Design a protein around this ligand. Sequence first.
Ligand SMILES: O=c1ccn([C@@H]2O[C@H](COP(=O)(O)OP(=O)(O)O)[C@@H](O)[C@H]2O)c(=O)[nH]1
Length: 471
Amino acid sequence: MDKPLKLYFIPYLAAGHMIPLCDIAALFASRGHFVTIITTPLNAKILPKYNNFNVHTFQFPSQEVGLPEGVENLSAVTDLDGAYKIYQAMALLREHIENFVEQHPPDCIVADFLLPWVDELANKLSIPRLAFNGFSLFTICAMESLRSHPLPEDASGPFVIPNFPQDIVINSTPPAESKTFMDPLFTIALKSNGFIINSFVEFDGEEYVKYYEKTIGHKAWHLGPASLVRETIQEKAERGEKSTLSVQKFVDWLNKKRDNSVIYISFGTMCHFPDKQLFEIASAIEASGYDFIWVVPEKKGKENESEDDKEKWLPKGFEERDNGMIVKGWSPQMVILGHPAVGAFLTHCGWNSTVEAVSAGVPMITWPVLGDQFYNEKLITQVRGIGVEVGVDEWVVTSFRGMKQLVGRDCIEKAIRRLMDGGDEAIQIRERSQKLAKITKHVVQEGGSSYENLTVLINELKQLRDCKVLN
Ligand SMILES: O=c1ccn([C@@H]2O[C@H](COP(=O)(O)OP(=O)(O)O)[C@@H](O)[C@H]2O)c(=O)[nH]1
């Protein structure tokens, strides 16, 4: 405790991984330790400078991979071809990230599991390495259960998480490509000194801290929710990028609406639905009759579209009926989720949006797509009971318009009304959502579970640095 720790954080150029890790680094910084983000200039510009908070950037290799100069994240990409160009950009930066870490070795490296080469880098420098994937510990425990008890290569439909602390049924089997991509990364992540979890034990579950520790034989650190590090309006509004619309334009509009009368629809920064699916979503939105905030990254840069182009995905006259806001870009998700007018959150079950909704006490209408989301769906609806399910069952490989099955409008409206119409089921769902919101308000506060976990982690990291000084 005599001298602060020097911690490096290497996020992946994706909003779902970049945003939570930087807020976790901000938690270390408010303790008094010198944290350093290693990313690209555009991912660093939005980062609020805290005490002990600094960045080390290398220029994004734009023409080496063949992308426009303003594109330095997966959220700016609209194509699977563009997604791999981000990956090759990470491969090119690896050379300079390794040289910088070797020249100025830190007390501890915290890197995303999509960068598994950090294992050798931390090993040859003999410094403790932490892993981060943005998942829930529940989801990590479930995916490690399938990796030990695999599905037969003819499986289809629902399946049970094998030999699990609770009996839970996922509504679709993972694609073969997901297993062959996740399995190598999880194996290297388990070689680390510990896993950082952007969550808190009251939400994941103690029975899964003890599952991960005793069955899998590894350490996980519940430091979340990290978004709670942002307290001001400007801190909650400036996340990832600048919001496309004036933050005051959202607040003024929402301030006129009733409490729990607006539905927020957003499917993350990696999911783009085809025009036919957006048409069903919009048709279900107007048939529900509720005011809405709909995030449509599929149409960013497509304003003042021709009527022929807008009728590909919107019912005729949808925009003339001004019962909501179409955000064709980046919306202040923390600002909108925290407003009392928002009563439901139609989500893709990405983990950042999940813990953000938990902190805001907004029940969720679940629509998983890929990755950890199908596991996250049942953590929201069955285990914790803070949402309803649309009923989707297509686990896609690519969320860049890879959906082959159409989710009907009646299916969506039925799910929207189950929370917004204020039924008995919806009333007690919101009561279970506020119960977690009150718990979440102090988990990273002094005395909270996530706070004391960060204290124990920093001590053990300080211990290992003291041993390296001996040698
Ligand atoms: O218009 C948008 C879309 C997303 N987000 C943020 O981006 C993250 C989305 O990550 P998540 O894990 O929920 O989904 P992913 O994009 O990784 O699939 C969350 O922090 C959201 O608050 C945002 O601020 N504005």
